[PDB]
Amino acid sequence: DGLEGVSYIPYKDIVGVWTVCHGHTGKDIMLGKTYTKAECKALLNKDLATVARQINPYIKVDIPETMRGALYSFVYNVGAGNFRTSTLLRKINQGDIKGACDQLRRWTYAGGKQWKGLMTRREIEREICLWGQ
């Protein structure tokens, strides 16, 4: 029972890049292969671990494990080099969770990319914002 909006067979995106599962790209993709749900989750695990490797040095405080997972999903979608990522991490490091929530809530109705992964953008907002309350 495949998830809505997940392609289990690799396809070329608009800019010509092979993609599969939760927006996975990379030289590891097997063209023509029908991926299982478990394999798609393994690719997501691999991609989020890569995000974590990039941003962990910039997370300087202990945070709830749910907030951590939310941050990895955020960065996976928005990009580690985006100023939005830098400002979000800085606010969390400072304990300005309300400020982090405010930042995220500007984008609630943007509605751009398909958010990739098993979390939704609203779930990320909820995770950070519910700690600000």
The answer to whether the beta carbons of residues 93 and 61 sit under 8 Å apart is yes
The total domain count for the chain is: 1
> Is 125 tagged catalytic?
no
3-class SS at 87? helix
From the number of C-beta atoms within 10 Å of its C-beta (0-12, 13-18, 19+), residue 74 rates as: buried
User: What domain range includes position 67?
Assistant: 1-133
The active-site residue out of 4, 28, 62, 65 is 4
Q: Please, which experimental method was used?
A: X-ray
Q: Which segments of the chain does DSSP mark as H helices, in order?
A: 37-55, 65-78, 83-94, 97-105, 121-132
> Is 13 tagged catalytic?
yes
Q: CB-based contacts of 93: which residues, under 8 Å, 6+ apart?
A: 58, 59, 60, 61
Say which CATH number the domain at 8 has.
1.10.530.40
CA-wise closest residue to 76 among 116, 109, 40: 116
